Amino acid sequence: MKQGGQGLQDYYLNQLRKEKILATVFLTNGFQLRGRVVSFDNFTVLLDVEGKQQLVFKHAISTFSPQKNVALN
Amino acid sequence: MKQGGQGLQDYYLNQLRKEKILATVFLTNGFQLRGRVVSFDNFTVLLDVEGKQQLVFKHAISTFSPQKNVALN
Amino acid sequence: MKQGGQGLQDYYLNQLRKEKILATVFLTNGFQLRGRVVSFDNFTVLLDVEGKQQLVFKHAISTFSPQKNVAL
Amino acid sequence: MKQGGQGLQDYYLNQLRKEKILATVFLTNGFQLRGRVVSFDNFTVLLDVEGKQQLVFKHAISTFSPQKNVAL
Amino acid sequence: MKQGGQGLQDYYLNQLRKEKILATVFLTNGFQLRGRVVSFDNFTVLLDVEGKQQLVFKHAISTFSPQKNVALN
Amino acid sequence: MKQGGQGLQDYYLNQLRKEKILATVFLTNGFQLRGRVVSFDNFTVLLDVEGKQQLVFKHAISTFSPQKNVALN
Numbered sequence A, B, E, F: 001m002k003q004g005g006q007g008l009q010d011y012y013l014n015q016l017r018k019e020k021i022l023a024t025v026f027l028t029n030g031f032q033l034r035g036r037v038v039s040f041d042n043f044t045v046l047l048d049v050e051g052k053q054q055l056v057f058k059h060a061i062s063t064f065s066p067q068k069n070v071a072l073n
Numbered sequence C, D: 001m002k003q004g005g006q007g008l009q010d011y012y013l014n015q016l017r018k019e020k021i022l023a024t025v026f027l028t029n030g031f032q033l034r035g036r037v038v039s040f041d042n043f044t045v046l047l048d049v050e051g052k053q054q055l056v057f058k059h060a061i062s063t064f065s066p067q068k069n070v071a072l
Helices: A007-019 B007-018 C007-018 D007-018 E007-018 F007-019
Strands: A023-027 A032-040 A044-049 A052-057 A061-066 B023-027 B032-040 B044-049 B052-057 B061-066 C023-027 C032-040 C044-049 C052-057 C061-066 D023-027 D032-040 D044-049 D052-057 D061-066 E023-027 E032-040 E044-049 E052-057 E061-066 F023-027 F032-040 F044-049 F052-057 F061-066
Touching (some): A007 A061, A044 B007, A052 B007, B032 B052, C007 C032, D007 D032, D052 F007
Antiparallel strands (some): A023 A032, A032 A044, B023 B061, B052 D061, C023 C061, C061 E052, D044 D052, E032 E044, E044 E052, F023 F032, F044 F052
8 A cells, every 4th residue: 555665755745735734845955945735746746835836856855844743653 | 658656747847838837947056947848758858948948957956936837636 | 574775774763763862864955953763764754853743855864963872 | 769768868968969069068066068969878978078078977967058959 | 695786885885894994974065074884785874983873875975085095806 | 798878887987997097076066086997886986096095976976077088989
């Protein structure tokens, strides 16, 4: 029921997506977006930032920092 | 069909290309490009910048920030 | 029971997680977080920084620096 | 005759190479080279900059910007 | 035996570890560490820095600069 | 007689190694080494810089700039 090795990632981002939890996404270049997850695959995260879409490549992402903790397993 | 975990990225860039949406492409090094997606594969995105082609590697791309939102399913 | 080639990484992070060792996580951009390891996979590490969760991509991590050494 | 997923990249670099199009190659660290494509594989591009060879890693390349557009 | 195209890296770090050679590890972000290789896998290198362990990801390492040369075959 | 997709790379670095051609190796962090190739695998290049070994990860390398052009195919 998952791809081996990315259970934390897929579960976590999927919880952020379902609940639409606001999060600060720190990028590797040090820039940052404060928005919500619309969608994601293995390489990209589609983000809702103040009503505007932002397609962010995962390799550019440093950290997801949610405003509310996600329930774990 | 041929897919894997990259439905989101492919669909999205394909929508930007087909709808000729103007997008700002923020690269990880800080540089930016305003243009349109002519084409793309798994590693590169061909952009149209004022009639001038620009071949951009996806590993160097941070975010795609479109002028208009893409209709998702 | 084991993916070859990542025994050091997996064992080491699993120990910091079980032993609740406080660690400074240096990111490749010079940012750093001081917290504990809650979970991890092949790409991400979930961190506990003063009560708040921090999902960190491993490709962005530069160094784990624990407060207490891990037994090997 | 074709590795799926890299048709744009391979075709495009092959055209710059055959047509000897002068191109500015932006590297991810802000460096740039102005020369022509001699050869390439899945990881490297061999460049001709004013008579001198420059073996450039593709993971370090940010953008190819040709003097003349490639026909698609 | 288990190998692939990584004979050079494995042999070398293994020689540094077995011979307890002091090496400066330059990371891509500019930071440096003087210490010894305790252990390593395909992605990480465990270092000893003044009795303090430091888990370093190989993708963030630029160069290993040893205090003494390693005998190669 | 090779691994598909890295013929230019393996041939080129092997020519630099056999002839011991001096080259400036530009790293992605903008630092640089002027030396000769002792060995290489798929991930690392062992470098001779003024008689001192430098194990450089390939992912940190930006450019090899030889003092003498390598004969091609």
